[PDB]
Write an enzyme that holds these catalytic residues in place. Structure first.
Site, PDB file in Angstrom:
ATOM      1  N   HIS A 259       0.849  -1.209   0.000  1.00 40.89           N
ATOM      2  CA  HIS A 259       0.000   0.000   0.000  1.00 40.89           C
ATOM      3  C   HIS A 259       0.868   1.236   0.000  1.00 40.89           C
ATOM      4  O   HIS A 259       0.322   2.371  -0.214  1.00 40.89           O
ATOM      5  CB  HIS A 259      -1.044  -0.014   1.110  1.00 40.89           C
ATOM      6  CG  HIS A 259      -0.545   0.391   2.440  1.00 40.89           C
ATOM      7  ND1 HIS A 259      -0.210  -0.477   3.453  1.00 40.89           N
ATOM      8  CD2 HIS A 259      -0.429   1.647   2.978  1.00 40.89           C
ATOM      9  CE1 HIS A 259       0.155   0.188   4.554  1.00 40.89           C
ATOM     10  NE2 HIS A 259       0.012   1.518   4.273  1.00 40.89           N
TER      11      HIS A 259
ATOM     12  N   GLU B 274      19.092   7.550   8.016  1.00 37.87           N
ATOM     13  CA  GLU B 274      18.352   8.692   8.581  1.00 37.87           C
ATOM     14  C   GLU B 274      18.161   8.611  10.054  1.00 37.87           C
ATOM     15  O   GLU B 274      17.800   7.532  10.574  1.00 37.87           O
ATOM     16  CB  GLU B 274      16.986   8.780   7.894  1.00 37.87           C
ATOM     17  CG  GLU B 274      17.057   9.326   6.455  1.00 37.87           C
ATOM     18  CD  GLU B 274      17.260  10.804   6.364  1.00 37.87           C
ATOM     19  OE1 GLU B 274      17.712  11.419   7.354  1.00 37.87           O
ATOM     20  OE2 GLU B 274      17.027  11.376   5.230  1.00 37.87           O
TER      21      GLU B 274
ATOM     22  N   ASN C 236      17.088  12.343  11.937  1.00 38.90           N
ATOM     23  CA  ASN C 236      16.196  13.468  11.731  1.00 38.90           C
ATOM     24  C   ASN C 236      15.941  13.547  10.220  1.00 38.90           C
ATOM     25  O   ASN C 236      16.863  13.860   9.434  1.00 38.90           O
ATOM     26  CB  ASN C 236      16.802  14.765  12.220  1.00 38.90           C
ATOM     27  CG  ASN C 236      15.793  15.874  12.197  1.00 38.90           C
ATOM     28  OD1 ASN C 236      15.051  16.071  11.227  1.00 38.90           O
ATOM     29  ND2 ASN C 236      15.749  16.657  13.278  1.00 38.90           N
TER      30      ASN C 236
ATOM     31  N   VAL D 111      16.771  17.125   8.501  1.00 43.50           N
ATOM     32  CA  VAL D 111      18.113  17.730   8.641  1.00 43.50           C
ATOM     33  C   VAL D 111      19.108  16.775   8.100  1.00 43.50           C
ATOM     34  O   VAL D 111      19.073  15.555   8.456  1.00 43.50           O
ATOM     35  CB  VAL D 111      18.418  18.034  10.143  1.00 43.50           C
ATOM     36  CG1 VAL D 111      19.836  18.668  10.300  1.00 43.50           C
ATOM     37  CG2 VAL D 111      17.352  18.978  10.718  1.00 43.50           C
TER      38      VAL D 111
ATOM     39  N   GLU E  62      23.552   9.879   5.971  1.00 48.48           N
ATOM     40  CA  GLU E  62      22.516   9.471   5.002  1.00 48.48           C
ATOM     41  C   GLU E  62      23.124   8.943   3.714  1.00 48.48           C
ATOM     42  O   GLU E  62      24.226   9.383   3.255  1.00 48.48           O
ATOM     43  CB  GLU E  62      21.687  10.703   4.562  1.00 48.48           C
ATOM     44  CG  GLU E  62      20.901  11.346   5.725  1.00 48.48           C
ATOM     45  CD  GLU E  62      21.589  12.446   6.507  1.00 48.48           C
ATOM     46  OE1 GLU E  62      22.833  12.678   6.344  1.00 48.48           O
ATOM     47  OE2 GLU E  62      20.888  13.141   7.261  1.00 48.48           O
TER      48      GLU E  62
ATOM     49  N   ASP F  65       0.144  -7.608   1.818  1.00 44.50           N
ATOM     50  CA  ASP F  65       0.595  -6.207   1.789  1.00 44.50           C
ATOM     51  C   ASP F  65       2.098  -6.135   1.877  1.00 44.50           C
ATOM     52  O   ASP F  65       2.697  -5.791   2.934  1.00 44.50           O
ATOM     53  CB  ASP F  65      -0.090  -5.406   2.932  1.00 44.50           C
ATOM     54  CG  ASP F  65       0.109  -3.906   2.802  1.00 44.50           C
ATOM     55  OD1 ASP F  65       0.597  -3.450   1.735  1.00 44.50           O
ATOM     56  OD2 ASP F  65      -0.211  -3.187   3.804  1.00 44.50           O
TER      57      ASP F  65
ATOM     58  N   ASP G 195       1.299   1.972  19.858  1.00 48.17           N
ATOM     59  CA  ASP G 195       0.973   1.350  18.544  1.00 48.17           C
ATOM     60  C   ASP G 195       1.745   2.026  17.432  1.00 48.17           C
ATOM     61  O   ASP G 195       2.378   3.108  17.653  1.00 48.17           O
ATOM     62  CB  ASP G 195      -0.538   1.556  18.268  1.00 48.17           C
ATOM     63  CG  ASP G 195      -1.136   0.686  17.219  1.00 48.17           C
ATOM     64  OD1 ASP G 195      -0.540  -0.213  16.602  1.00 48.17           O
ATOM     65  OD2 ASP G 195      -2.384   0.876  17.000  1.00 48.17           O
ATOM     66  N   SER G 196       1.784   1.417  16.253  1.00 49.31           N
ATOM     67  CA  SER G 196       2.199   2.148  15.048  1.00 49.31           C
ATOM     68  C   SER G 196       1.080   3.010  14.525  1.00 49.31           C
ATOM     69  O   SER G 196      -0.089   2.786  14.911  1.00 49.31           O
ATOM     70  CB  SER G 196       2.670   1.117  13.999  1.00 49.31           C
ATOM     71  OG  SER G 196       1.647   0.229  13.683  1.00 49.31           O
TER      72      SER G 196
ATOM     73  N   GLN H 160      -0.284   6.049  11.152  1.00 48.18           N
ATOM     74  CA  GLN H 160      -0.098   6.655   9.818  1.00 48.18           C
ATOM     75  C   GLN H 160       1.330   7.261   9.697  1.00 48.18           C
ATOM     76  O   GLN H 160       1.800   7.936  10.650  1.00 48.18           O
ATOM     77  CB  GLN H 160      -1.146   7.816   9.617  1.00 48.18           C
ATOM     78  CG  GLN H 160      -1.324   8.489   8.228  1.00 48.18           C
ATOM     79  CD  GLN H 160      -0.096   9.058   7.510  1.00 48.18           C
ATOM     80  OE1 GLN H 160       0.585   9.918   8.004  1.00 48.18           O
ATOM     81  NE2 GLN H 160       0.160   8.620   6.261  1.00 48.18           N
ATOM     82  N   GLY H 161       2.012   6.945   8.607  1.00 44.02           N
ATOM     83  CA  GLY H 161       3.393   7.342   8.309  1.00 44.02           C
ATOM     84  C   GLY H 161       4.434   6.268   8.702  1.00 44.02           C
ATOM     85  O   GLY H 161       5.588   6.343   8.272  1.00 44.02           O
TER      86      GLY H 161
ATOM     87  N   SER I 233       3.706   3.072   8.075  1.00 42.49           N
ATOM     88  CA  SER I 233       3.374   2.068   7.070  1.00 42.49           C
ATOM     89  C   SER I 233       4.586   1.639   6.298  1.00 42.49           C
ATOM     90  O   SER I 233       5.406   2.493   5.870  1.00 42.49           O
ATOM     91  CB  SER I 233       2.434   2.697   6.001  1.00 42.49           C
ATOM     92  OG  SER I 233       1.147   2.844   6.565  1.00 42.49           O
ATOM     93  N   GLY I 234       4.749   0.341   6.108  1.00 43.35           N
ATOM     94  CA  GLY I 234       5.846  -0.206   5.325  1.00 43.35           C
ATOM     95  C   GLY I 234       7.084  -0.476   6.157  1.00 43.35           C
ATOM     96  O   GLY I 234       8.006  -1.185   5.661  1.00 43.35           O
TER      97      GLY I 234
END
Ligand SMILES: NCc1csc2ccc(Br)cc12
Ligand SMILES: [Ca+2]
Ligand SMILES: [Cl-]
Length: 223
Positions: free
Chosen positions: A40, A52, A54, A57, A62, A84, A171-172, A174-175, A177-178
């Site tokens: 998804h 990563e 932050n 920044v 990275e 999924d 919990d986990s 939105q954002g 995901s994956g």
């Protein structure tokens, strides 16, 4: 992540951010060329951001590498979220080091009660919205199949498990995901869905990675 803690910079070295002008999903580095995420999360024009902490920044560890190919699972159903899972190939191999490292795939499924680490840059509030810049972490147990099913009648397939706390608060979200759910040093889950975040009797639902290891390995072997 709701009710978690600041992981610490680069302490989750397999965690990547998928960026299309902004962070929109997590993922997990599984070798120098390939990332595991949720189907998804598919879209074109992904840049994978490794190393990563932050995400707003540039801090010095990275690696930014564009995807060359995305492969959504053959049986992904976007209505039920069954299967999924997707794979993303990097245009060039990541430099692996203590801060950018692959996570091992399971060799068997994990049991209910096993402790796991769930991580991401998703929303930190269960009512309300606040997005962290640094990576957040949560330790949570896998829940029994029977409690997962009773929490979400008619919706849990054999390719899903629940993890977290029936009481709510942790919990986990939105954002996230994956992103990864790692248990005893193996990637056992991918952040997939739930009903809200951190609500009583509504634990997080995760893609059951152990069901996909032969598809993952054969896909990587031919792509
Ligand atoms: N655990 C819940 C969960 C996971 S991904 C996601 C996206 C949106 C919302 Br709302 C919840 C969730
Ligand atoms: Ca950064
Ligand atoms: Cl759904």
């Amino acid at each position: 992540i709701v009710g978690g803690y600041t992981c610490g910079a680069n302490t989750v070295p397999y965690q990547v951010s998928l960026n299309s002008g902004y962070h929109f999903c997590g993922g997990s580095l599984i070798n120098s060329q390939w990332v595991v995420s949720a189907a998804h999360c598919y879209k074109s024009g992904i840049q994978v951001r490794l190393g990563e902490d932050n995400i707003n920044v540039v801090e010095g560890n990275e690696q930014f590498i564009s995807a060359s190919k995305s492969i959504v699972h053959p049986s992904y159903n976007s209505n039920t979220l069954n299967n999924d899972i997707m794979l993303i190939k990097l245009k060039s191999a990541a430099s692996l080091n203590s801060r950018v490292a692959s996570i091992s795939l399971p060799t068997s499924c994990a049991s209910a009660g096993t402790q796991c680490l769930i991580s991401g840059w998703g929303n930190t509030k269960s009512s309300g919205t606040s997005y962290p810049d640094v990576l957040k972490c949560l330790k949570a147990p896998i829940l029994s199949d029977s409690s997962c099913k009773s929490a979400y009648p008619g919706q849990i397939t054999s390719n899903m498990f629940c993890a977290g706390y029936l009481e709510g608060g942790k919990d986990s979200c939105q954002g996230d995901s994956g992103g990864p759910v790692v248990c005893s040093g193996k990637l056992q889950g991918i952040v997939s869905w739930g009903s809200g975040c951190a609500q009583k009797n509504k634990p997080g639902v995760y893609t059951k990675v152990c069901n996909y290891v032969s598809w993952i390995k054969q896909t990587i072997a031919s792509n």
